[PDB]
């Protein structure tokens, strides 16, 4: 048993969806604690070197970050291993590139370019309501954020809209049947659909039944269901409408692209 | 050192298991405080550095504590005279060792100074006009460094009186 926490991470043990080459090396970046966890995040360096290709090595990323050339939720970050998660805001004013981090159908991270009208807020999921010191109510979110004195109408599992400049709630979408959702966990990551039914088993998980826009139906547990508006998404989403094609169609598309 | 790990015990069938690692620091214990009633010498409390930087204070000698009368809602600080009953062992009583659950005798001055002039439980008044009152210890000396408690009343008081009467 290791006498303390773990500071390394073998490349072969890294999450599958990060898409890291087997021969790249023995080691891989180790994300640091922050807004999101290890298995629900991705480091900055991977976005800035293996995707956008603005850097070729660790050193270039170090210089770019320490020069303060990237903003996260309106705040410059200088850690190459800082974790980037879901429904976050990515801005690079030098090239005027604004992205919101969402999930693709295949179950991997993607950058959705956006406008200036909606980059001042983010959507977050509320999953804990509790009493703090002196008995003052609080709440928490999927990005490790705490807000004091919320409205009583807000309950757990809901979704909250908050300005980037100020962490003040603007509007909240309830968790109810007939609302569009985005799956964010397991075999169905990235699929968009509307709720149809809710079944609860005492002392265990709660299962949600949704129907895609084209009629496909699927299930998952309530711990990975995210609300994105009332019958219509509040934010801009990737080109495809959360439709997971079959193997035949993907093979056809690959053949066309080749 | 002292430990409470279960590797050194036997199985439900009474068989020897065998040791597969050396001793570990999570599974350690410490020598008992053995809090003594005072009856150089004075209130002596020490401190212990526990896991995670926490601080645990155990008392070695003390003489005062806070006591309550629930029925009359009266609470003051008093002096403990001696211990007179303890279920676990009689040796503790002879040595006047303080632990949770010990039945002690307190002085009546802080209570009689305001009582004996209001209708209340008869037995408590009888104790008040005397020099001592039966009480109990509710805190855990050796873990918080204090000795608090409450005054007896009702069936339990009868139980303890019947127990210690012949002596």
């Amino acid at each position: 048993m290791a006498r303390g926490v773990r500071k390394h991470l073998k490349r072969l043990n890294a999450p599958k969806h990060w898409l890291l080459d087997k021969m790249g090396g023995i080691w891989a970046p180790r994300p640091t604690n922050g807004p999101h966890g290890l298995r629900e995040c991705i480091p900055l360096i991977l976005i800035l070197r293996n995707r956008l290709h603005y850097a070729n090595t660790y050193a270039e990323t170090s210089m770019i970050l320490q020069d303060k050339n990237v903003l996260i939720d309106g705040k410059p970050r200088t850690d190459p291993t800082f974790p980037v998660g879901f429904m976050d805001v990515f801005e690079i004013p030098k090239v005027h590139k604004t992205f919101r981090v969402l999930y693709d159908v295949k179950g991997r991270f993607t950058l959705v370019p956006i406008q200036s009208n909606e980059a001042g807020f983010k959507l977050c999921r509320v999953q804990k309501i509790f009493l703090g010191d002196k008995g003052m109510p609080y709440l928490s979110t999927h990005d490790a954020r705490t807000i004091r004195f919320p409205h009583p109408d807000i309950k757990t599992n809901d979704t909250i809209k908050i300005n980037l400049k100020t962490g003040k709630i603007d509007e909240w979408y309830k968790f109810d049947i007939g609302k569009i959702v985005m799956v964010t966990g397991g075999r169905n990551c990235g699929r968009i659909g509307t709720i149809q039914a809710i079944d609860k088993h005492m002392g265990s998980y709660t299962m949600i039944r949704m129907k895609d826009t084209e009629g496909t139906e699927f299930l998952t547990r309530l711990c990975n269901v995210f609300v994105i508006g009332n019958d219509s998404p509040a934010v801009a989403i990737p080109t495809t409408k959360g439709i997971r094609p079959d193997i035949i169609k993907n093979r056809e598309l690959r053949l066309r692209s080749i | 050192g002292i430990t409470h790990d279960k590797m050194y015990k036997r199985s439900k069938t009474g068989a020897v298991q065998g040791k597969w690692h050396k001793k570990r620091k999570y599974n350690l214990g410490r020598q008992p405080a053995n809090t003594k009633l005072i009856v150089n010498e004075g209130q002596k409390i020490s401190t212990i550095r526990c896991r995670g930087g926490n601080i645990k204070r155990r008392a070695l000698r003390l003489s005062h504590g806070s006591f309550a009368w629930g029925s009359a809602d009266i609470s003051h600080k008093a002096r403990i005279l001696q211990v007179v009953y303890n279920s676990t062992s009689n040796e503790l009583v002879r040595t006047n060792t303080l632990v949770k659950g010990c039945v002690v005798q307190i002085d009546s001055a802080p209570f009689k100074s305001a009582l004996s002039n209001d209708t209340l439980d008869k037995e408590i008044l009888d104790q008040i006009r005397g020099d001592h009152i039966l009480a109990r210890i509710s805190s855990r000396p050796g873990q918080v460094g204090t000795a608090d408690g409450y005054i007896l009343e009702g069936p339990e008081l009868l139980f303890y009186q019947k127990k210690l009467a012949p002596k």
Partner: protein, 201 residues
């Protein structure tokens, strides 16, 4: 070797000198004497008679120093804690066992460390200068090519005054904001219930 390089130091003049001793019988008046104990110079009749000295330390023949509460004429071993004399620690909480000569003075010593406390009117070959200067504000205030002078410390300059005032202002603002947020919340909830810690005093 049968000798003792006696070291003499003067706090007032900061002058130190050493000599040599070739005998012991002249030093039977030195035996049985502990540290921090007066030792008359009558034994040293060559201009040190009528002068009082105090023993401060020494080293035995093998080099082992002399500890305080040993109260013995022989060196012994003991576990030395961090920060104790004659022990240099390598780790934060490392201990070490080593030999030290007992405080009691005896014929075995090859060195002696003695000071001068009270001297006779006669002068001796053995003024105190200063190599550095006080640096704190209080010190210099109490006491009144390249030019080198120490930089000053503990002195208040405007930026510190502004910093303290700003910190006070920010703290007051924070407390006021929390107070008004709480009051607005309490004004709300007119149709429900609350439980919070009342401010006493």
């Amino acid at each position: 070797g049968s000798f003792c390089k006696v070291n003499i130091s003067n706090p007032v003049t900061g002058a130190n000198k050493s000599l040599m001793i070739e005998d012991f019988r002249k030093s039977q008046t030195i035996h049985g004497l502990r540290m921090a104990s007066e030792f008359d110079g009558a034994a040293l009749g060559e201009e040190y008679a009528g002068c009082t000295f105090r023993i401060t330390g020494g080293n035995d023949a093998q080099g082992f120093p002399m500890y305080q509460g040993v109260l013995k004429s022989q060196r012994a071993r003991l576990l030395l804690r961090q920060g104790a004399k004659c022990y240099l620690h390598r780790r934060n909480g490392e201990r070490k066992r080593k030999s030290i000569r007992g405080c009691i003075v005896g014929p075995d010593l090859h060195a002696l460390s003695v000071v001068l406390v009270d001297a006779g009117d006669k002068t001796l070959p053995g003024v105190v200068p200063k190599r550095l200067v006080p640096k704190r504000a209080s010190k210099i205030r109490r006491l009144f090519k390249k030019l080198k002078y120490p930089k000053v410390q503990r002195v208040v300059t405007d930026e510190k005054y502004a910093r303290k005032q700003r910190v006070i202002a920010e703290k007051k603002e924070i407390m006021r904001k929390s107070l008004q947020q709480l009051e607005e919340y309490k004004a709300l909830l007119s149709r429900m219930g609350k439980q919070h810690n009342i401010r006493i005093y």
